[PDB]
Design a protein around this ligand. Structure first.
Ligand SMILES: CC(C)C[C@H](NP(=O)(O)CNC(=O)OCc1ccccc1)C(=O)NCCc1ccccc1
Ligand SMILES: [Ca+2]
Ligand SMILES: [Ca+2]
Ligand SMILES: [Ca+2]
Ligand SMILES: [Ca+2]
Ligand SMILES: [Zn+2]
Length: 316
């Protein structure tokens, strides 16, 4: 909407206060004009018709319980935008500052979040498996990263290409979490998963097997559930990424860690220059090796570590 840029204040899902960029025209709207062609947050009002209505507030204060998922979807989309622009010189998900749209309060008791081809969508959870999912910065960045993938490599959402798609979202979700630097870890969704259970998460990148996800190609799922295991087999690539960054010895194979920033550079280059809609795990290895070669040189530690990591997870 046309109006003037304003700064509201509110509390997120976890009870933390933050400032948000809003737009004033009669009401204060969750419309951040400071980033690209805007970040827009909508109320789906417990229904499934999208996007719903652009979030309107009378006083620019967002402290109601109902406001919390909107505050976080809006704010964490901003952090994710900043990560891609500042770290990778990428302007929004399409590289041309496309407007970023999110809807919260999607459906009832909805234990998921997704990119629908055009926008991000967040359930409130059922209060048992999840609380409102936009409360996780890794979750918000995971979702926006699906848009980045769709505009770039275009990895088909099934089987190996789909597991790569998933891992890319977990990897960048985690890198954005580290970028914001509030309780960062290599776990996925810990801030919004199972409020009655401390210390767990939806997935682990450091040890995918702790939740039954494979950490080696020999343990891959080849059935038809979950689009051929896209949220399961992602563990194999998540583990490789974790090893590249942090190092470790895994199934007897030692990997020299090169750190998060270089992991991000290598995978961003792979995603945007080398991967295609049908890339499989072996092709991802080749793309990562080539990306590291471009960035650091063929004789570099970075290239050697990429090879080590894929060796460790059984991907040749
Ligand atoms: C980061 C996480 C919190 C959310 C993440 N959501 P997502 O991967 O975007 C779905 C699918 C689809 C939707 C719209 C258009 C095209 C395709 C996820 O892992 N969702 C899956 C969560 C789950 C559910 C049941 C069993 C295991 C895991
Ligand atoms: Ca208000
Ligand atoms: Ca965390
Ligand atoms: Ca996390
Ligand atoms: Ca929990
Ligand atoms: Zn996903």
């Amino acid at each position: 909407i046309t109006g003037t840029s304003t700064v509201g204040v509110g509390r997120g899902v976890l009870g933390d206060q933050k400032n948000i960029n809003t737009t004033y025209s009669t009401y204060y709207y969750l419309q951040d004009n400071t980033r690209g062609n805007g970040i827009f947050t909508y109320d789906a009002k417990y229904r499934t018709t999208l996007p719903g209505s652009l979030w309107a507030d009378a006083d620019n204060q967002f402290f109601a319980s109902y406001d919390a998922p909107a505050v976080d979807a809006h704010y964490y989309a901003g952090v994710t935008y900043d990560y891609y622009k500042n770290v990778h010189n990428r302007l929004s998900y399409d590289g041309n500052n496309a407007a970023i749209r999110s809807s919260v309060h999607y459906s009832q008791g909805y234990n998921n979040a997704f990119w629908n081809g055009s926008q991000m969508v967040y359930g409130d959870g059922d209060g048992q498996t999840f609380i409102p999912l936009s409360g996780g910065i890794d979750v918000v960045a995971h979702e926006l990263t699906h848009a980045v993938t769709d505009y770039t490599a275009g990895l088909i959402y099934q089987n190996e290409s789909g597991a790569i798609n998933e891992a890319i979202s977990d990897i960048f979700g985690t890198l954005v979490e580290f970028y914001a630097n509030k309780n960062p870890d290599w776990e996925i969704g810990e801030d919004v998963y199972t409020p009655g259970i401390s210390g767990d998460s939806l997935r682990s990148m450091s040890d995918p097997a702790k939740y039954g996800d494979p950490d080696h190609y020999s343990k891959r799922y080849t059935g038809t559930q979950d689009n051929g295991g896209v949220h399961i087999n992602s563990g194999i690539i998540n583990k490789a990424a974790y090893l590249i960054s942090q190092g470790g010895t895994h199934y007897g194979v030692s990997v020299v860690g090169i750190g998060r920033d270089k992991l991000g550079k290598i995978f961003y280059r792979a995603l945007t220059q080398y991967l295609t809609p049908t890339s499989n795990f072996s092709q991802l290895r080749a793309a990562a090796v080539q990306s590291a070669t471009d960035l650091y040189g063929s004789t570099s530690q970075e290239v050697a570590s990429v090879k080590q990591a894929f060796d460790a997870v059984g991907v040749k």
